[PDB]
Structures are given as structure tokens and as C-alpha cells.
Design a protein around this nucleic acid. Structure first.
Ligand code: CLM
Lengths: 117, 201, 48, 27, 103
RNA sequence: CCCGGCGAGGGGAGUGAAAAAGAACCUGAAACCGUGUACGUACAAGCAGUGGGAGCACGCUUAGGCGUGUGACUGCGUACC
């Protein structure tokens, strides 16, 4: 009962070289190199799902700050103003409003200015 | 506990412990596995590193050459002369308890009754040893894939059945567990019942 | 009951071990022997 | 008529004797 | 005119006719949902929240599809320590079309 | 029948179901070596990936800012055993 490997082993390798498309040099050609490349791709992929959520918030905060200071208040006071005014609009939405409706954003600065005084 | 005869209309009284008892799936399965294991020609072999034809000299000087160290051109890592754990002829047959065998025959036979795959008749024989003659009879009874168990090893019946693949003939003494399963219908003579009954009891 | 509708009893046929066949099996590398020393060796061990 | 060549590329040349041979160390 | 509302424990800024992808809702794909907790409504003029949520403010919407998104692969991997796994995930979602912003 | 050293090797015709079945002949994978288009690249410094993420080009997105490729800038990031 001799079992030959030919068909199954090729299929397993071809799956990996397919995951390695676009990579430079041996990493897309040579299984031994590709297999290490594809795993580390996975390790970074896992990681950057968590990192992505850090990067975007830093962006939103930075944009609100710019627009807040444009209406004559700092980010840190503005958010505190909104909290004591019991406004709950989050920073993804606020950074969006900061760009596309500067007039609504100004109205949120007053709302937050009133409460803060 | 009565099995109705096909045509004579003369019911036959049998032991409910033999023909009327519950199907033991786990038991039957064990006895069918051992029969099939009992059928193998355990005939094979390969060569160990001791048995491959070739020489005992180390290829290398142990040290100094850049190669991997070697001891034997018959090492199982080497092309030719491999086979780390080579096969021998071996006996695959298994034990079955007398009682687990009989108990198993009884369970399957009792199911045959329940599934209406068992056919009881007064007599079952043929005239001249012509397979064609048997073939005619079998169509008439609406049977095709069938095991025949007769009272005595009837020869005409035996000869006529040899070329019919879907038909097998057997005397009561020579029955076995897998044949009673492997056919769509099973035919037993009245005499065949009495012999099977005594045997299992 | 046909030859292709028979099974063993549940819990009748435990599968048993096959060492050194990948990380997933749990027994890849070493094979349950630990690392080095007399017990890890082929034919290795002390008498009764 | 281009039959394969003898080649005579059997390569039992491996492996020739191998001294350092060499630096003296280190005592 | 847009409005802001909660749903899949996250917020969305949306206008009428827009399709927006939410966390899974227990609603059949032809029924209408109402979101009655709305953080802002803005048109020519703009009513914002004081107490959280707009007083008279309701958003009505139609559930258009349930489905599953692109597969993502999780890999965990401890080098030299004879450990890894790999593992799959597809996340549920409901898509809704905004049909009404009620101020 | 041609090119061609009365060569090799090719191209036609013809055989042949099929010649990309033609004696270096069943099928006919990859490392490796090529030709052809798409995009990228000569002020720009490092496990070559991933998270962002401009173009430009395709399949019209087959009226719906949709799929494939390519991907400038940019945040993280020292292979495996
Ligand atoms: O092989 C030698 N040198 C090795 C190099 O691997 C080592 O660096 C070394 C150097 C100096 C020495 N000494 O001065 O006695 C001994 C060893 C001999 Cl000189 Cl000992």
C-alpha cells in the first residue's frame, strides 16, 4: 500500500505562491522564501487591524484641532465643552463635519463655548 | 413466532430467540470485519538495510571531505536500498468467540425476517443441471440477486448456479455471516431451517 | 442492514497516535519525548 | 545520426585527500 | 440635508437616498426600520443635540440586504517556539437605504 | 518544392483524428531562460512586508465615482530552524 505524494504536495505549494503574488524576487518564485514571506504578511496583517484604529483617530483629532482653532478654541477645551453640553458626536463624524460643513462646525463651537463658560 | 411458507401455506414454528430477536449493530459489525480480515493473503515484503544487495564499505573518510557523513550506500535515506520498516508476510486473521459468532448470525437472520428478505419454502431444487432452467425459475419467483441455502448440497442446483453471478448455492452446514447480508433476497428450504435452528439453538 | 450501513459502537474505535506530523497534530517535533538525554534516544532507556 | 555522447562524466573524483595543510595552532 | 445616528454601536452621517452598511439587524430584507436616537439634523439650518438625541428627530430607513463581507485571515505565530495558528472570519452586516429624515 | 556548404536546421506541400503525436516522438509541472503589452522607477538611503493611500491603464462601473492591474507619497515593521 504505497502512497505517492505528487498531486497533493504541488497543490499545497501552489496555494502559497498564489498568496505571494506581487512580491519581489525569490519571494514570489521560491516556495521556501515565499512561505516565510506569506506568514510574516499574516503577522503584520493581524497587527495592523489593531494599528489602523489608532492611526485614524489621531487623524480625526488633528483635523478637529485645526478647525477648532480656526473658530478660536483649542481641541482640548472644545471636546470638554461638548461633553459638559452633553453633545456626544464622535470624532470621525466631527472631522467629517470639520471639512464639509464649516458652518455647522462653528455652531458646535458656540454650543461648546456656552457650556464651558 | 411463526414464519409463513411462500406457497404451501403451512406456517413453520421457529425459536423467537433465533429468528425474532433484536438487531445488535455493534456485534454484527465486529464479526463481519473479522471475516474479511480472515480472508487476506498476508503475502508481501520489502528489504531492510540488512537485505539490500550491496557492500559494507563506508563511502567517505568520516572527516575532511565536505560531504554529509555516510556509513552505508544501503541507508534508507539513500536512493536505492531504502525501506526503513520493511514488511514481512503476516497473518491478518482475528479471533471471534463461538458465542459472538452464533449470536451475530442470529441477529442478522432475525433482521432478514423483519425486512422480508428471507424466503421460506417447502422445497427448492432443480431438474437437469442447466443454468438456463434455474434462470427461468428465478424470474418466475421474482428473484434475481439471491443466496440459496438448501437442505443438502444439491448438485444439479449447484452446477446450474455457477455461471449466474447474482446467484449462489450453499448447504446449511456451509453458511457464513457476510453472504446472508450480501444478497438482496435469501432462500431457505424447510429442511434448511431445521438445520440452521439446531446449529444456533 | 446492508454491507454499507454497518458501523461500530460510538467510542469503540479510538484513533491512536501518529507522532512527528506537523505542529497541528500536537506531536510534531520530538514526538512526546522531551529534549535530549537517554529517554529521548532510539532504543533509549534503562532496565527494570 | 546524433546519438548521445559518451560524455564520460562519471564523477567518482570525489573526494581527494584533504590536509589543512596548513597553519600551526595554537598550543 | 444630512443627519447623524447610532446603530451598530457606531455613528453614521447620512442623507436621503444613501445606502449605509450597519452591524447585523434582526429585520427581514423588505421591512422598514426607524432610528429614533439621532445626534444631529442639518439642512439650511441645523438642530443639534442638547440632551443627547434630537427631541422631535426620527430617521426612517429600509433594510435592503443581509450578507457577509470579505474573508480575512488571522495568523498567530510564535517564532522558534513551534507555535502557530491560522483562523478565518467573515463578518455579518445589514445594508439599509435612508428613505426619510424627519426633523 | 524552397532557403540553405550535394550541409545542419528550418519553411511549404503531403501523410496522418490529431504532427503544438514527427523519431531530442503518450501527458507534459517548477527552479531556470526568454519575447510581448499594463503600470512603476535617475534628490533618493535599510527582513522588501503590511496599514493607510494619489494617479494612470483595463474589463465600461456593460447609463449606477463597481472588479483587475499597476501603484507615487506615508504610518508601523531585525527572515526561518
Ligand atoms: O588556532 C589558533 N588560534 C586561535 C584561532 O581560532 C585563537 O584565536 C588563538 C589565538 C591566540 C592564541 N595564543 O596566543 O596562545 C591562542 C588561540 C592557535 Cl594560534 Cl592557538
Amino acid at each position: 500500500a504505497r502512497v505517492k505524494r505528487g498531486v497533493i504536495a504541488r497543490a499545497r505549494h501552489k496555494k502559497i505562491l498564489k498568496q505571494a503574488k506581487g512580491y519581489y524576487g525569490a519571494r514570489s518564485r521560491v516556495y521556501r522564501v515565499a512561505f516565510q514571506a506569506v506568514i510574516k504578511a499574516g503577522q503584520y496583517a493581524y497587527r495592523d487591524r489593531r494599528q489602523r484604529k489608532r492611526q485614524f483617530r489621531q487623524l480625526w483629532i488633528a483635523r478637529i484641532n485645526a478647525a477648532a482653532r480656526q473658530n478660536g478654541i483649542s481641541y482640548s477645551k472644545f471636546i470638554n465643552g461638548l461633553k459638559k453640553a452633553s453633545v456626544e458626536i464622535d470624532r470621525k463624524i466631527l472631522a467629517d463635519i470639520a471639512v464639509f460643513d464649516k458652518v455647522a462646525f462653528t455652531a458646535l463651537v458656540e454650543k461648546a463655548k456656552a457650556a464651558l463658560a | 413466532m411463526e414464519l409463513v411458507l411462500k406457497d404451501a401455506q403451512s406456517a413453520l414454528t421457529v425459536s423467537e430467540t433465533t429468528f425474532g430477536r433484536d438487531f445488535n449493530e455493534a456485534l454484527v459489525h465486529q464479526v463481519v470485519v473479522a471475516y474479511a480480515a480472515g480472508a487476506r493473503q498476508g503475502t508481501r515484503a520489502q528489504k531492510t538495510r540488512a537485505e539490500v544487495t550491496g557492500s559494507g564499505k563506508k563511502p567517505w573518510r568520516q572527516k575532511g571531505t565536505g560531504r554529509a557523513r555516510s556509513g552505508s550506500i544501503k541507508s534508507p535515506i539513500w536512493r536505492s536500498g531504502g525501506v526503513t520498516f520493511a514488511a514481512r508476510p503476516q497473518d491478518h486473521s482475528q479471533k471471534v468467540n463461538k458465542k459472538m459468532y452464533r449470536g451475530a448470525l442470529k441477529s442478522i437472520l432475525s433482521e432478514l425476517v423483519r425486512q422480508d428478505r428471507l424466503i421460506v419454502v417447502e422445497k427448492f431444487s432443480v431438474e437437469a443441471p442447466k443454468t438456463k432452467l434455474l434462470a427461468q425459475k428465478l424470474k418466475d419467483m421474482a428473484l434475481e440477486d439471491v443466496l440459496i441455502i438448501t437442505g443438502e448440497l444439491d448438485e444439479n442446483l449447484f452446477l446450474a448456479a455457477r455461471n449466474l453471478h447474482k446467484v449462489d448455492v450453499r448447504d446449511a452446514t456451509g453458511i457464513d455471516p457476510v453472504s446472508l447480508i450480501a444478497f438482496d433476497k435469501v432462500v431457505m428450504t424447510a429442511d434448511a431451517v431445521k438445520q440452521v435452528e439446531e446449529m444456533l439453538a | 442492514m446492508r454491507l454499507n450501513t454497518l458501523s461500530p459502537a460510538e467510542g469503540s474505535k479510538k484513533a491512536g497516535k501518529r507522532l512527528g506530523r506537523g505542529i497541528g497534530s500536537g506531536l510534531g517535533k520530538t514526538g512526546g519525548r522531551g529534549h535530549k538525554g537517554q529517554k529521548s534516544r532510539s532504543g533509549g532507556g534503562v532496565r527494570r | 545520426e546524433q546519438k548521445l555522447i559518451s560524455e564520460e562524466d562519471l564523477f567518482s573524483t570525489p573526494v581527494w585527500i584533504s590536509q589543512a595543510q596548513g597553519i600551526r595552532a595554537g598550543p | 440635508m444630512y443627519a447623524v445616528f447610532q446603530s451598530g454601536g457606531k455613528q453614521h452621517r447620512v442623507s436621503e437616498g444613501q445606502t449605509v452598511r450597519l452591524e447585523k439587524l434582526d429585520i427581514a430584507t423588505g421591512e422598514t426600520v426607524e432610528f429614533a436616537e439621532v445626534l444631529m439634523i442639518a439642512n439650511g439650518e441645523e438642530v443639534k443635540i442638547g440632551v443627547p438625541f434630537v427631541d422631535g428627530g426620527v430617521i426612517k430607513a429600509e433594510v435592503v440586504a443581509h450578507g457577509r463581507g470579505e474573508k480575512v485571515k488571522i495568523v498567530k505565530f510564535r517564532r522558534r517556539k513551534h507555535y502557530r495558528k491560522q483562523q478565518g472570519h467573515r463578518q455579518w452586516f445589514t445594508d439599509v437605504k435612508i428613505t426619510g429624515i424627519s426633523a
